[PDB]
Amino acid sequence: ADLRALAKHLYDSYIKSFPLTKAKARAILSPFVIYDMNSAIRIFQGCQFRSVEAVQEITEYAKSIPGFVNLDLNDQVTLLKYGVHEIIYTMLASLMNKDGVLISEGQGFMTREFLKSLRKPFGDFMEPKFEFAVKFNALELDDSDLAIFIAVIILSGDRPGLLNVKPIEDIQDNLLQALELQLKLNHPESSQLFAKLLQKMTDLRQIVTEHVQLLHPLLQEIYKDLY
Amino acid sequence: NPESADLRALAKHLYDSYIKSFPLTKAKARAILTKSPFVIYDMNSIRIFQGCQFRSVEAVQEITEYAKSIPGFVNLDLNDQVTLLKYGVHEIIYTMLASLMNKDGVLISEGQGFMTREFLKSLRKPFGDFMEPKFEFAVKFNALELDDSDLAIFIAVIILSGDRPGLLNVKPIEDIQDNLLQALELQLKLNHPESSQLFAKLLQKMTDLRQIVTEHVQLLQVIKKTETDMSLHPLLQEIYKDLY
Ligand SMILES: O=C(O)[C@H](Cc1ccccc1)Oc1ccc(-c2cccc3ccccc23)cc1
C-alpha cells in the first residue's frame, strides 16, 4: 500500500537527517562520564546551542515529509516554530536513561544527579525531561516508529495562527494511518500502542509549557527566538 | 468477532452509567440550544464565580458517582483512586462543559438559562478571561460531533490514566485504560463510520485539555489573593493542593 512506501521514505529520511539514532544511543547506554564538577551557566547555554543545531536538522527533515514543502510559507514557519521544541524533547528521550543523558553526539554521558545538584535556577532545568523520558522510553519505540511520530507532530493543525489547516490535516491523516500500520507490523503484542503514543503528546506539551515558563551581541543574535 | 462483542457490552454499561450519572446530557443540551432558555447578555437581569464553584463541586460529586461504575475502578488501591480522581475530574469538567457550549454562549442553571460569551468577556479585573479559554476549546471539541455514547467512554479513559503523578500500582490502571481504549475505538468506528481517524484526533484533544487545566490553575492563583474576602471550597482546594 501507500503507507509502507511512506514509512520507508520517512525512515530513510530520518536516518539521513539525524546522525545519532536511537539504536546507537541504546547501544551505548565508551563515553566520558561527567558525574561531578571535576568532570552553572555554561551547561545551559551549551544545551541551547545544541538545540539550535537540532532545530536546523529538524527543519531539514521536515522538508522531506511529502507535501510539506508545498504548503503556504507562513504555515510552514508556524508549524516548525511550535513543533521543533516538542521534537527536541522527543529526540532527547532517545539519549536518556534513569541515571543520565548521552551528550556530545554520543561521546559523553552526563549523570542525572550532577544535573540535579546545580544551583537553584538550573536544578530543575532537566528533571522534567528525565521523568518524561522514563515514561516515553517505556514505550520501547525504535527509530522507524519515531520517524513517523515526529512527522505527525510537525503536521499539527491546531497551532495558533495557521492560514490553511486542510492540507495539513490531510497529510497528518496519511501519516497517522502509516504510523498505526507501522506499530501494528513492528509491535504485534503491544495492544494499544497507537493510543498510548498519542496520549504522550499531553506530557510533551506540558514539558514545553513549563520550560517556556522557566525561561556578545552577535552570539545573542544567533541564539535568540528559536531557543 | 468475539472480542468486539465484549467491547460492545462494556460500551453499553459505560453509556448506561453515564445516562444515570449526569441529568443534563449533550442530547438535551443540543435540543435546548436549537423548552427555550432565558438569555443573559448584559448586567440588566464575583457572583458568577461563586456560582461556578457551586456547580463545580456538584460536578465533582456526579463524576465520582460515575467513576465508581467504571469496571475495576472501585477495586483499585484507594490511594490510586484518590490520585486519579484528583488529576482527572477537572479534565472531565471541561470535557462535559463543551457539551453545553456553542460559539455564542453557555447554558446555565440546569439548562434554564443561557449566558452570552460577550457578557462573560466583559467582566471586571482578571475575570474577563475566565471563560474565554473554555469557549475556545468548546468550539473545537464540539466540532468532533461526538455523542453521549462516545463521551461516556472518553471520560472513563480520561480517568484511567497511568501517567498521573504518584501512582503506586500503574499496571492495573494501564490494563483498564487499554480495555477502555479498545472499547472507545470500536464504538467510534461503528457509530461514526465515515469520520476518518476520529479516534486519533479525539485522543489528541487531551493535550488542549491539559493546557486548559494548567492555565486555569494559574488564573486561580491570581484570583484568590486579590480578593482576600473570596473563598475556595475544601474539595477543590484539596484537588488543587499538590497538582503540578
Ligand atoms: O475548576 C473548577 O473546579 C471550576 C470549573 C468550572 C468552570 C465553569 C463552570 C463551572 C465550573 O472553576 C472554578 C473557578 C473558580 C472558582 C472560585 C469560586 C469562588 C472563589 C474562588 C476564589 C479563587 C479561585 C476560584 C474561586 C470555582 C471554580
Q: What would CATH call the homologous superfamily of chain A? A: Retinoid X Receptor
Shape of chain A: globular
Tell me the domain tally of chain A. 1
The largest inter-chain interface, given as chain pair and residues per side, is: A-B, 22 and 21 residues
Helical segment count of chain A: 11
Question: How would you characterize the overall build of this protein?
Answer:
- Two copies of one chain form a homodimer.
- With 227 residues, chain A is mostly helical.
- Chain A has a single domain, classed as Retinoid X Receptor (Orthogonal Bundle).
- Chain A contains eleven helices and three strands.
- Chain A has helices spanning 2-17, 22-28, 41-63, 73-94, 112-116, 120-123, 127-138, 143-154, 165-186, 193-214, 217-222; strands at 32-34, 100-103, 108-111.
- The first copy, chain A, has a three-stranded mixed sheet with strand order 1-3-2.
- The radius of gyration of chain A is 18 Å and the shape is globular.
- Chains A and B meet through helix 9 and helix 10 of A and helix 8 and helix 9 of B.
- Bound molecules: (2~{S})-2-(4-naphthalen-1-ylphenoxy)-3-phenyl-propanoic acid.
- (2~{S})-2-(4-naphthalen-1-ylphenoxy)-3-phenyl-propanoic acid is lined by residues 49-50, 52-53, 55-56, 90, 93, 216, 220, 223-224, 230-232, 236 of chain B.
- (2~{S})-2-(4-naphthalen-1-ylphenoxy)-3-phenyl-propanoic acid binds next to helix 3, helix 4 and helix 9 of chain B.
- The PDB classes it as transcription.
- The entry lists the keywords Nuclear receptors, PPARs, transcription.
- It forms a dimeric assembly.
- Crystal structure of PPAR gamma Ligand Binding Domain in complex with the ligand LBB78.
